[PDB]
Amino acid sequence: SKGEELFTGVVPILVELDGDVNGHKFSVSGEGEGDATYGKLTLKFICTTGKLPVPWPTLVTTLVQCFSRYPDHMKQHDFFKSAMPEGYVQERTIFFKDDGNYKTRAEVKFEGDTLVNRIELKGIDFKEDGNILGHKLEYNYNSHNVYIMADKQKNGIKVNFKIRHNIEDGSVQLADHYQQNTPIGDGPVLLPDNHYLSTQSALSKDPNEKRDHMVLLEFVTAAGIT
């Protein structure tokens, strides 16, 4: 890829998310950087609107897989970076098990030399007393697997996968992610064979930040074929 070369060294990152769940309206901003040689991402995020209505861990997944580490042996399956710099669209529907769903649309691309992720998020059919909207997930994130299927039908990427969020009491809430990525440009692009992405993450709070916010450290590697 010519597009992979663009991820040599440290690239700053901007993130903007416009949101509505069961009609509660909100906005999130983040910034930081990433380093795709080591799958590393170093971010902080602010709710510009007030209290955030949903819990911070619901958003993580929605708040730039261009930064995942693909090792030499798996470079030919790195779709996200081959679509650079014109970028890609990334659409998702995320079903929470005994509760509502999120639908997301995102454009991920280079503006300037900044890798920017701009997001619209619609959530519906949530329970005002359930886990989400009742703030009942803990401030927490585990290590997950993200399976990538080639999606020739659209010149992109179909992806199932599932993440689990710990609830305050020992219980676990499943979030079933269905994903579609298509290129913005019509340049050639790489269509992956099936693989897992494996993650580590850590959520933290900045001492001198008064607004509702999440600090996020995250490492990501493509680990294998199916």
């Binding site: 850590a202 450290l217 490492f219």
Partner: protein, 159 residues
């Protein structure tokens, strides 16, 4: 022109601008200046591999174990990125060898992961804890096996 000396210094250390760093220091800039995220000139010079700036910042008393919001210290950055001499120097100036980023990585963790043998060796020599575990219970040994770096694994085994 003489406004915002701290930002100007952060920038200069990120961009490896040695002549600007000299000026800024000799002309009063805070050597421990930090942005919103606790990033400091020394973090930036350690990450980007700019040794002369690292040496200079430490001679004006740069806090060698300053911590950004992701719990990283300049030692983690240099050890991730592979800057052997910079690692050497930060250790000689009392860098905390078993410091923790927010995933519980130590710089040994980071260095074994990223495939930097000589940096590992050097961290072991300065007192690194071989059994130490990240928040997902990995060790620098595992991480090294995860990544296929046998000689690093072979090494970690012996301590």
């Amino acid at each position: 022109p003489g406004s915002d000396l701290g930002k100007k210094l952060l920038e200069a250390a990120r961009a490896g601008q040695d002549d600007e760093v000299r000026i800024l220091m000799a002309n009063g800039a805070d050597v421990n200046a930090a942005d919103d995220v606790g990033v400091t000139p020394l973090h930036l010079a350690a990450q980007r591999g700019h040794l002369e700036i690292v040496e200079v910042l430490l001679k004006y008393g740069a806090d060698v174990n300053a911590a950004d919001l992701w719990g990283q210290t300049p030692l983690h950055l240099a050890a991730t990125a592979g800057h052997l001499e910079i690692v050497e120097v930060l250790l000689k100036n009392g860098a905390d060898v078993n410091a923790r980023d927010n995933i519980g990585h130590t710089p040994l963790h980071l260095a074994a992961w990223a495939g930097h043998l000589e940096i590992v060796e050097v961290l072991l020599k300065y007192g690194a804890d071989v059994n130490a575990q990240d928040k997902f219970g990995k060790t620098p040994f595992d991480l090294a096996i995860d990544n296929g770096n046998e000689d690093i694994a072979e090494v970690l085994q012996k301590a």
